Design a protein around this nucleic acid. Sequence first.
RNA 1: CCGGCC
RNA 2: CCGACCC
Lengths: 445, 439, 439, 417
Amino acid sequence: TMKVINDPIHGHIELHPLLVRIIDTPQFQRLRYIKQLGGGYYVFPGASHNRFEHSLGVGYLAGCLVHALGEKQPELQISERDVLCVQIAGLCHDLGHGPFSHMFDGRFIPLARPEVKWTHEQGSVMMFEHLINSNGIKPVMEQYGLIPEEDICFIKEQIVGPLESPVEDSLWPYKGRPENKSFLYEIVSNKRNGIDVDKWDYFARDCHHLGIQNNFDYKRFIKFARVCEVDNELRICARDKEVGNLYDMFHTRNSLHRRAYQHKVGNIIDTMITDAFLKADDYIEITGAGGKKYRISTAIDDMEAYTKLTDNIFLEILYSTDPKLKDAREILKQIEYRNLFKYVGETQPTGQIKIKREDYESLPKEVASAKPKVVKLKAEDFIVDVINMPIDHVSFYCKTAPNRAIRITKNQEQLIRVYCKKVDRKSLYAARQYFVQWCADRNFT
Amino acid sequence: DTMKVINDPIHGHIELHPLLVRIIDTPQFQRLRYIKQLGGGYYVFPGASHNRFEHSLGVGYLAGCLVHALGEKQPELQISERDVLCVQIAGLCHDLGHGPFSHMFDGRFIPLARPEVKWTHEQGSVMMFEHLINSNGIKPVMEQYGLIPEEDICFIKEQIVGPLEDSLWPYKGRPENKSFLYEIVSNKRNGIDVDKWDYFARDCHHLGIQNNFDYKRFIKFARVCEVDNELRICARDKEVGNLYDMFHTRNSLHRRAYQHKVGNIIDTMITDAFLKADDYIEITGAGGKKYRISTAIDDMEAYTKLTDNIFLEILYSTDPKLKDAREILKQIEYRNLFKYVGETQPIKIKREDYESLPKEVASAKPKVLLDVKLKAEDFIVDVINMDPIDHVSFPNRAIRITKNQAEQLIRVYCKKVDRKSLYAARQYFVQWCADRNFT
Amino acid sequence: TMKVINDPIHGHIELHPLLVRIIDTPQFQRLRYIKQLGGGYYVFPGASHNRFEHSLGVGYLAGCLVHALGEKQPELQISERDVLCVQIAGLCHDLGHGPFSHMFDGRFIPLARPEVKWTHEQGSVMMFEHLINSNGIKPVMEQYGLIPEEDICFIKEQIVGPLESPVEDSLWPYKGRPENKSFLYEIVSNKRNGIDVDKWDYFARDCHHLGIQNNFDYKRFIKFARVCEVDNELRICARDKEVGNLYDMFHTRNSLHRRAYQHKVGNIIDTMITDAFLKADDYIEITGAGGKKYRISTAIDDMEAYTKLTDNIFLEILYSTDPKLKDAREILKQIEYRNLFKYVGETQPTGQIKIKREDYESLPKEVASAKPKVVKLKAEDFIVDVINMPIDHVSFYCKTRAIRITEQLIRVYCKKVDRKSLYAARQYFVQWCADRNFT
Amino acid sequence: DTMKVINDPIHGHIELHPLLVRIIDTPQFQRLRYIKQLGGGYYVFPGASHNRFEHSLGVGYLAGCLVHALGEKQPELQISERDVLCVQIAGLCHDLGHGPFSHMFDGRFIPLARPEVKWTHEQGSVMMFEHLINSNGIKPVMEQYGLIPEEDICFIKEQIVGPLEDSLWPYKGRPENKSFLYEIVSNKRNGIDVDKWDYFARDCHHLGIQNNFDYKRFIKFARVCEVDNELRICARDKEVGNLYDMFHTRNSLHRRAYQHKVGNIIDTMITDAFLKADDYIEITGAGGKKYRISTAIDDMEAYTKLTDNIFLEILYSTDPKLKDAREILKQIEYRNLFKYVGETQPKREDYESLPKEVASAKPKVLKLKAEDFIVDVINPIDHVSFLIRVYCKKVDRKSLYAARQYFVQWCADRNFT
RNA sequence: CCGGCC
RNA sequence: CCGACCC
Ligand SMILES: [Fe+3]
Ligand SMILES: [Fe+3]
């Protein structure tokens, strides 16, 4: 058979029934109610896109890029099973994300359970394993040509990376897929070369749903790629006559990152929503496997509970009558009545990074908030927003050149902000005083 | 204060006066953030996830632009501030009363569950606006900026709903001199209005429909003339071509919105699930009152807290009674969807006895001629009547030179998708069509 | 006075009365009858664009680029005296092109007068000087704030460069403007960075008239350009987020110069037109001032005669019944019946370049073409077309002072027979390759 | 031989049959390379430098595509390769009769020069095609590739102009059952043809105007049906908006380009130059006869060399007799043009003496008037789906108001207001 | 304004 | 595969 899904950004995205069966399942539709770009919802009016369009675009792009590379280089005779595994990994382009999208593994789960080491690529891999084990797809994976012993290892390594921690520079620590298909591990999720379909898809989707000028045209980049050996190792490389397209892509990436993903009021609302969701973690719970009340913070330990972790929790604070949920609803109401936290002051740290994960960030900030730097009163619960998170690409090899044409490498960490809302004018003066104190205190920022 | 500005993908920068901001900054208006215009179409159309907040902002912007263009083009209208504020407030209501899942709630859900209650979203918008004004103290601000609530609010409600009440000016908020301002946003007569234009533009932007319509030119070329006997806002320029392609795209995406096959079944399933879950989810009102799922329309204080979230309130529900109901929602998350048993074409139907339409369907589908078994309540019949181009186009008269040139499907989707029952369903559909009235 | 010109590429081109006075002269309408691609029209049916629109576009682009630099960087004191002066330099950057553009000085003049060195930039300078002295342009130059004694020298240096040859590396060899305006010599005629308005405009025009994809957009480059000091001097630099745009521009340049300016049949037709002019050089007289009869080749020595030397001469040979022009006319007729000189072979030797300009090129090629390279007989009527005519030199700003980040093709042509000519062409290509420094 | 391909900015690749190539690569067809499409409109639109050569190639391509699509779609019409080649040849040779500056030569010049002869450029196209066939030896090739000259040539000529001669099928090139092939290229009745599509597309390409009509879709949705009594080509699908946009494009092109005031003034000045230089320009025809500019239409040997070059051949002329003519050309060099004197609304040969009546009314208004009188009047629907301009020769600023008043008085007195 | 449709 | 070479 053959299914096809219409998406506005990548047009017609064609899928095969294994990919659909993984896709059209309860543990992916949860994404339909978690916005990919969360904190702009009350800042950028049009940025209401959900994870569905982002995942669809990533799947379409990965399929096109792996189908072009193999018709324009039919010397290795790759197998459909590998592409299916890569597509499964790609459909986890943002899968692990929970409420408020990237916040869940960005600023929610690490902030609430500081001792827990969890990342959303590993979470996506585990959720995919749960989907396989619950939805009964493995027998039909072996029926329709996939071997879990090697295909599952390949897909898991594509999704997460090096599963183990072997320390050997002159070795390939990836036994999931044989090196005769090494280039296949730079198509769906690559963090070193930077040629990944995810960035393309989410740049195009964010531009389409925000009305910003996106010039990049991935069709030419996909259509002009071949596998070439660079330095005793094989990498997928594009042609010389595309460097302007990738410059446009990089400028689109930077424009999207600096307009939205670090917006002032966007980050302020992100911080307020994240704090309100976090502070109610234990007493507004969902039930997982075995009926255990494994709360939102602890829901990372089980996938059955982790399924029901969506943006609804936000609303579940806004429309709740319980006395314990009072504070959350109150704060949300102050968000609705335009009593937002107005923000003033910014810095960037140069002294390596913080010691703790996020706990000590607030306490030192509150401490340094007060100082005798020449209004009245004083406070301690004032916010501290810490955001942590020229194409440097050498995959320009030419197909005609067997192992050359690198074009001489194409020729050539945290932002902290404050917010004071004591009074109409008193808050501005207090914010200036605190900005002075914190600046003189933030490790000589 | 002064103008605020909000960026939208459709109309770019939308500049609003302080009164419009005060209207926008309300819980009863920010509730619209979780109301998708295309609603259920999301489960079959990926990108159509826009919300009612931008739709309201866009309708307010379009109405302000229209009134400003009319004022600049025709100084003889003598536009004042009361008209501008009232028109903006009425414009920002282009879906104001819409509840959970918008047109699904009143087009298919509320009328199906309890046919005895009159539910139209314009009256709900009027009640919600009244609650907003009363709670938020809007009347003092309206006095503060010079507009008169006693007539502007009545005019806004009439524009939101229609006739205020002997075929002599049913609207009692404005005299006969402002005969064109009442069709800037709603325009129940002609069928082309700023609400439809703006939401067409936004739907085509977020759905992949190719919209060739340029609304700015139409706005810039508006003058007030006489059509038959009274004043009517007529398009000064000859935009017949543009509006031809406009109605083409309108039919394209209007019929795209009324989805077929998968979309219709998904919508019906969602509705039926809400109807089953009505008893197992409670909504709190004002004064401690608890109104059931369907009866929450009678109080605007409680209706302010009615958004799509009720959907989620079943998806996160654990009370045992809703169990079955929750499963039906699950039935659209996973791909085990039911197939539709056909469609047919036909006034004989109103807001009464529609809830028994499947029963008559059950009269023909079960126990059909030469048919054995396969009989149940599988009928989930859908009636979508709801509410060339044949455009009506409704300094000294005689210039309005007009140029030269129904029932929806009887769709009964079978709740049970059994493969064995497929042949029985085909036979039942043939018998039903050839028996009742249709083909 | 304020003129506006509609161009397909640049839209509305605004000009001021000095530019109009220069334009509406006999020595500019001469450009209107000279093909941009002389031998490209007999290959591309759309390439009928003339040098007139190209000059208009180049002048407009130069004016825009010098007008932006001074509004977004008002430290170099750019005045109305400078913008018009530049625009004039751009508008006359090709004023001296002869019949069939680059052919006239590319292959004709070296064949006709090998002892005289001629380039169409010198022709532009001489034609502009004649225009100034004859059309009374000095009074209106002085009327609109210009000093002809220095402005004419500045424009002439803009067209060609250093009028004199001073022996000093560390010197400013221009008498037009001091080094405080060095950037002004990087707008119309650039030899190092390759970013000049001339190339932009003629690339855009060739793309419009050849159906090629034009990715470069000069509007963004203009809007994001500033003057920056690189090596003790001022140079025009773009923004960092434009390197893809300039890569697209360079690839457009390469594609245009490998499709059209190196086209096989285009160059063959260029050679045929050149031969027809040569055979008719002695029998065609043009009369200037004083009745003096200057031939086609010698008309470069008088501008009054050189004005009336356009592409019409081609037709003036074709529609001629004079027996002495017979041979020339014959060749032109062979162009119409498409009896072109068939060509086989294209080699480039590694032994530097050709010694003479055009005379010794033909004779040695024909002579060496015959050898016992393992048909029969021999001939000497074989032409030899030798055409001579990567992003590091382009500098751009780094952020918001910033600095930069971190040749002879020879072809032949034999038109003997369908098979004999091919064999002889292969034999001659073998012989020339084995003889011309083991080419 | 083999199929040829020509690159055009409008239609991309244009594939031609070898017979079409043999027809094209002839002097009487390559003559179109030096005849401007818009003609005098070029001196008003610097980008409109396209010629009739690419227009003819494009019209041939469009007609071939349309006929091939009709043949493939509906086999009951029994369209063969002979019909396709004949339609293509009629497409390529539908404007061979155009003279210098295209429509100016017969719309403005011929009626003044020779009012006793009725001359339309379609007849010139027919005569030029006949001369092309006879001189270039096309008939052996037409016989070689399956065409039958005795009737195929008559069919092509009929497609160019129409009936050579009881209201019963006047055409004699093909039977009455193929009544739709006669309106693919010319289409005098319906008014939509490949010629109009191609020259609209090219005008919009070279003028900056927007082109909304996609001809490929219309071709792909074309079927032959019956409206009243006979077979007629029509758009089977409802491309009504596309056709309305095409007609809007037609109206815009006609209003802006073909009716520009300065364009008409340029045409009038070139026309006056030709009328003055008629007696003193000799063109060698066939048999050594010398045909004037006006009398070169009677012999195709002289008419082959009658192109826009004669313009330049007056501009650079040194004979004293041509002096006056050259001087009038000199005016365009300095943009000295006739000024506007007003507009008014109501055969070209009868209007040859028009200015005299203008001199009858402009003089002694409520000779200088005769001198300044340069009057050049130059004066969806039925589709199956699913003004006077007296250019003022005297450009005197003081006399401008008097000339305007005289023209107004003349118009408001004689027959108009 | 004689190469604008403001 | 001489008005193209890969649109
Ligand atoms: Fe140039
Ligand atoms: Fe024509």
